[PDB]
Amino acid sequence: MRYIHSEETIPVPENVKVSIKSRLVTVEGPRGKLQKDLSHIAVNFSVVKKGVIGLEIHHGSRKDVAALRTVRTIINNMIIGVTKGFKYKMRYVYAHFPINVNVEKNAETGCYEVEIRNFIGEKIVRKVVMAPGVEVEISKAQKDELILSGNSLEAVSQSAADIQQICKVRNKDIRKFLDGIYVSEKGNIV
Amino acid sequence: AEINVEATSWRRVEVGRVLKLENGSLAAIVEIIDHKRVLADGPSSDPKLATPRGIVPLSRALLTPIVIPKLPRGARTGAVKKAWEAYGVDAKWKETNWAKKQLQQERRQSLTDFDRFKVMRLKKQRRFEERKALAKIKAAA
Amino acid sequence: SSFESVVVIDGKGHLLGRLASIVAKQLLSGQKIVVVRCEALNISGEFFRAKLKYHAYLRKMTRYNPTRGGPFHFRAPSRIFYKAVRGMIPHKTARGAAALERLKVFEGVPPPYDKKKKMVVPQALRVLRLQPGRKYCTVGRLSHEVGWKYQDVVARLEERRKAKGAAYYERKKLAARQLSEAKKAAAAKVDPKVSEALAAYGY
Amino acid sequence: KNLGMRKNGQVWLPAKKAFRPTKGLTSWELRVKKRQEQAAMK
Amino acid sequence: PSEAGHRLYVKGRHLSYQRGRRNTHPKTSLIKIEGVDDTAAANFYLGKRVAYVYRAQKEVRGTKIRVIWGKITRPHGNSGVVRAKFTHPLPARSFGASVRIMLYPSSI
Amino acid sequence: AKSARASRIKENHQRFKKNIAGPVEAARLERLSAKLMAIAQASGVKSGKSIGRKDSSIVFPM
Amino acid sequence: MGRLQEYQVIGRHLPTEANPNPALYRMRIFAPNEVVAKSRFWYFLRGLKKVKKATGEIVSVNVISEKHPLKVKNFGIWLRYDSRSGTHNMYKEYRETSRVAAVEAMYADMAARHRARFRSIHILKVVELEKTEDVKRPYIKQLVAKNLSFPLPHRVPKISTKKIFSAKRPSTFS
Amino acid sequence: AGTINKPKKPTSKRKTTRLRAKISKRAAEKKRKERKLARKNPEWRSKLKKDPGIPNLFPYKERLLQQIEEERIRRKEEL
Amino acid sequence: SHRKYEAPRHGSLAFLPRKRAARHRGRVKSFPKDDPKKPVHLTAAMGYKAGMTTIVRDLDRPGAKAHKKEVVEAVTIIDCPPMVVVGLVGYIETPRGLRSLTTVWAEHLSDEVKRRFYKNWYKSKKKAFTKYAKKYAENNGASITRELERIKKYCTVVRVLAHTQIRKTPLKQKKAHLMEIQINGGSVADKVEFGRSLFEKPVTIDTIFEKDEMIDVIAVTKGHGFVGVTARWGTKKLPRKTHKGLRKVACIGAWHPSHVQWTVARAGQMGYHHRTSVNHKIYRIGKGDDEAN
RNA sequence: AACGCGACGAUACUACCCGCACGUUGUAGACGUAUAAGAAUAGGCUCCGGCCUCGUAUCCUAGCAGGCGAUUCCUCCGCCGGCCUCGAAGUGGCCGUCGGUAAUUCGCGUAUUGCAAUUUAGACACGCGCGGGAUCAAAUCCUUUGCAGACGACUUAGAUGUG
RNA sequence: CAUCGGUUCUGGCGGGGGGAUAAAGGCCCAGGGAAUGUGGCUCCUCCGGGAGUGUUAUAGCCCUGGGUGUAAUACCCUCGC
């Protein structure tokens, strides 16, 4: 079955500017500006109402209709990123060797870098380079905690996943060795 | 909440939309059968633009920018003809650039050998003044 | 249908097999064809299928001596297109050989083909042939993954060529504007009988 | 704000709606009448 | 001076003989006429005289140019390719060579 | 054993190149370049300013 | 199954001394021509009654033309078809302009979707849905919707196959 | 599976004449053996076939049931 | 059937064919990758092998067993008379590869490098580069300036032409060796200025290489002529009094295809192959004028 | 790649270059063998007014295979020279001279090739020519070497020298 | 080249007959009906439009019968040029 018309709607707050040109969405708000190329999905954008974006597919199959939900959630996440931001709080715990985490800003690349030392007594220094736009802060309120803040949910969550996956225990019982860095809390900055 | 979205704007097949068939005639859509076939009637006084009532495939039809306003769905030939002469579809079609191109094509294919020779000579005579004007423009600026 | 001295085809946006079939038929009919931008030809299907097919091609080789008789696997996109064309021409006959000498294939647009009109074939264009939603790949990416060494050089040369073409098209816009102004000015000096006769004749 | 919790923890996820591409093709009262007719028929 | 042409013939290309998948018949040749793409256009050129002009080696009777004459007999297929019969069958090396389709004998 | 074409060994070698052998080879390079720099130092058409034309084929001959 | 026409075929058993006036049996058969119509009549009549061609006669064959071929109608077709499993019912609907067009579309659709041929499809009933609420399948419930207006995105222009080379890249917006 | 980077030996779909002849002979023998087993089969087979019935989605199933009603009533009255 | 006891192949397939090298002088197949932020420098040189000798080295290798001890090592002596730069070759990038665009030579060329262009120098009129030497004089070297600015404008890789001073060696050969040495570092204009400043000037080895640096040596090996499989590939000798040769391979094939494979050990040319050896440490760059080097 | 390519040096000889002087010289096949944006195709172009299925378009297209003489026009084309410019297999722009030139109109000539017979006409390459300008070269055999080697092949050396 | 004969390919034109004396369809006449409910009225409103009402109104549609009508056309058969 091919459905003749299928539509989704996105409400837009007052402080958001959305510019779509050849399926390239540019969302700018108080915190910053994000861009995303959605040209790989056949979709027609329109202004159905004031502050309302309309997404429509004509003569599409069920897969083509279902793709609009992904596009809707992507644009909504961009709007939430430029309005409230995204914040991932991570906690690093240890049993015997205290894990040392250093955060600096590589200014030549314009991006933050995290150096992890003494992970279960290893002499190697693990290094994680952040995606641009993600800011790393060692939390002063709680103990042994990083905070990743940004406008791009994909960038912040991918940086968090990189920090988890660079600290993995190998050739040991994971029931006994609980060392590592884990994402404790996910939420919005504001 | 100001939003700047520019996108494509297709013409829409609907009740009242005028199609131009492959043979050059015109029809108005009165009923949509499916996404590939429509029911259309061309009740025009001009025999070149006239079309009998019947099924028109959308692959052999083109969407013209003329839409008959408030054409009832499934209207028969008398009602479609009344709406046609009321809205003046023939004059608007003659005004559109598609009919001008079709008329130009017919005028070019209706030429004889003497006609082509005269076209050549008159085009050279006009080209002389055009070349003089172009030379003056290029010399001035 | 028309007979030209030589036809220059732009390879961008074309399907490899359909373009190869059309080029092979025209070469056997007696037409000289130059195909440019073979790195921008398209193959239908997702890229891993084309990569797997070229690796299965690379697997085949003559066992007792790999320097003679074996399938010589060319990695350039122009030579990939040339192999596709040669598979559709009786290349072991004198007629097929003479048909193959009428073909030239290149990566990018080398001079003097940058100042020649590049035609397209609507029966092999990807945008007109493939259904939307289907996946496609590019011959240049496959060539770069299987061993072609000059992707970046062709890219820099194409950037220079397109900058020169942009300057040329600025000059072309100026010339077109001047021609339109010249026609508008000369409309007031041409004989009205001549203008009406041309309008009635369709010119 | 959102008064509930989400199991995956994606608190930014909107309140999604049911994927019903055949929506709006019939009305509720007509469906009730058809239900009564099918019950009598069976 | 006049800067025009002097062509009174339509260009064509000698494609192949009349053939199946394996068996070829050199008596009848196939010609693609320029601008002809269907049987309705080929019907106009049925009966016209088509000449193949080639160059020999020795000069015989004032020229080194030889002509093979023939006539277009019937259309072939649906794409305006025509069949022609010549005085002698055309050379097999001339597959893809150019032939001249005259405008005579004319019924206009 | 880890191979020569192993990602971890390549990363270790890249770190060694960037941090250790790099400055040494660099300083040797300025010393050698200065030494041989010492040896090295110790109309348009009619002047060559405009690069003019010097004093099979890509296209079909026609 | 070709350009189909609908035929009223009336036949009967041959009159004997025992039964001077045998019963007449009438069927509506979609067939390409009268020979196929009479053959299908004898097949279906052998499937129901003790009449065959050697013991019966064809009284009448009449073409049943559509009353209003210019009116777009919705048709419900109830049918049985043979698979490797056995006999199965299907009810389908088709939005067409005539019964013969609906039956031809049904034959093409059943061939495309279930690989059923003319030999293994029995047409039991073809009806016209006189009201809109009689429409049950969603693909025609979406066609009978109020104010049905849709565009035609990505229309490949009709270019002649004999014109091999074009000088500009075609547009897909008209 | 590492199939894209290193494909294995391809499986030929080009049929062998000997193989096709043997397969045709085996198919004919299987058809014959199935005919023999069908003739010698003692499993019960009903003479009557189960009626597939009328679909519920047919909108005039009520109306069909009505002319069935006066058809059987007229048949009983005539009988 | 299968081979019962596994054994690795004799010889490497990476050095096929085992033919004589196409040229006596070694070819630099690849140069070090050019970094434009680096200072301009030369990347290669030539010398002549004198011989070998023995040294005693005080080793400083932490973690080694011979740490803070004396080791005896074999070393090779290469005589390196200064090289004279007499040319400049420009290279451009094409989708077919690197292409030489033009070549600018020096005004005065020595008889050593002029002998390279001749096979019979004693019978010749020695006319080489005589008309080319006059384009330095006519129009104040306008053609030379044009070619140099062509290199500056269109080329990406710049190489000097340098020839050895073979008259300072004890060799009886008087024909010098000429090669292209790529300038690495800087921009193309800097490379061309560097080359023109280096025309007609001798360049010593200590301005190209330094002590404690690891380099590569490219040459042609010692030729051995036609040599059988036992010494050419290291195959196991057949037992004593094996019929028809015991310094042979018993089976050049026992399996399909009905051919001899390219991977089977066969008798042929051994030695005189072109080889590039890497990671050779320079231990001392001694000076000729020193009487205690 | 021994039937892939580039740069460079010297090039005796009829050999090299320039001009016209033509070919019973050769070419998978001239006949207007005319035409450069790029990019997207669920979007583009613009002169910013608007335009977009459409190359069915644009340019060129008349004259003994295209003369002579005017009337008339400052339009188009070509060869040279200058200055710039074009390296992906290198070529175009402007200016200046010169030559030709129906955009309008007219006169004188066309015949006889006899009612059709390719309309012998283009481009590239090659050779024979003359009339001029330019330049006086190498390789191999032989002797020798042993960095090499079955033999060829290869590294050398042999003309006044550091032989 | 013209006029012909035999064989054959292809294009166009003028007629005749048949069916439900095609079925449609247009213009009128007489009834009946419904919504994917027109105008009007009412209620919400972002006032852009929706929702309710009922059978033509300031759009129309469907069903039945009759006249033009032996209408035209499609399809099939056929007589010729």
Automatic annotation (TrEMBL), chain C:
Listed GO CC annotations: cytosolic large ribosomal subunit
Signal peptide: none
Pfam family, one: Ribosomal_L13
Any GO molecular function: mRNA binding
Keyword terms of this UniProt record: Ribonucleoprotein, Ribosomal protein
CDD domains hit by this protein: Ribosomal_L13
SUPFAM superfamilies (UniProt xref): Ribosomal protein L13 (SSF52161)
GO aspect biological process, one term: negative regulation of translation
Record carries keyword Ribosomal protein: yes
Function statement: Component of the ribosome, a large ribonucleoprotein complex responsible for the synthesis of proteins in the cell. The small ribosomal subunit (SSU) binds messenger RNAs (mRNAs) and translates the encoded message by selecting cognate aminoacyl-transfer RNA (tRNA) molecules. The large subunit (LSU) contains the ribosomal catalytic site termed the peptidyl transferase center (PTC), which catalyzes the formation of peptide bonds, thereby polymerizing the amino acids delivered by tRNAs into a polypeptide chain.
Similarity comment: Belongs to the universal ribosomal protein uL13 family.
Name of this protein: 60S ribosomal protein L16-like protein
Species of provenance: Chaetomium thermophilum (strain DSM 1495 / CBS 144.50 / IMI 039719) (Thermochaetoides thermophila)
Organism lineage string: Eukaryota, Fungi, Dikarya, Ascomycota, Pezizomycotina
Automatic annotation (TrEMBL), chain F:
GO cellular component, one term: preribosome, large subunit precursor
Domain DUF2423: 1-42
Region (Disordered) residue spans: 1-20
One Pfam family of this chain: YBL028C_N
Domain of life: Eukaryota
Name used for this protein in its record: DUF2423 domain-containing protein
UniProtKB/TrEMBL annotation, chain G:
Entry-linked Pfam families: Ribosomal_L18A
Gene3D superfamilies given in the database record: 3.10.20.10
Source organism (scientific name): Chaetomium thermophilum (strain DSM 1495 / CBS 144.50 / IMI 039719) (Thermochaetoides thermophila)
Domain Large ribosomal subunit protein eL20: 4-126
GO cellular component terms listed in the entry, alphabetical order: ribonucleoprotein complex; ribosome
Listed name of the protein: 60S ribosomal protein L20
InterPro entries noted in UniProt: Ribosomal_eL20, Ribosomal_eL20_dom, Ribosomal_eL20_eukaryotes
Keyword Glycoprotein in annotation: no
Gene Ontology molecular function, alphabetical: structural constituent of ribosome
Protein family (similarity comment): Belongs to the eukaryotic ribosomal protein eL20 family.
Keywords of the record: Ribonucleoprotein, Ribosomal protein
GO annotation, biological process: translation
From TrEMBL, chain H:
Highest taxon, organism lineage: Eukaryota
Localization (cell): Nucleus
Composition-biased stretches (Basic and acidic residues): 40-52
Residue stretches of biased makeup (Basic residues): 6-39
Chain residue ranges for the region called Disordered: 1-57
Protein name according to UniProt: Putative GTP binding protein
Organism: Chaetomium thermophilum (strain DSM 1495 / CBS 144.50 / IMI 039719)
Complete-protein stretch covered: 2 to 80 of 558
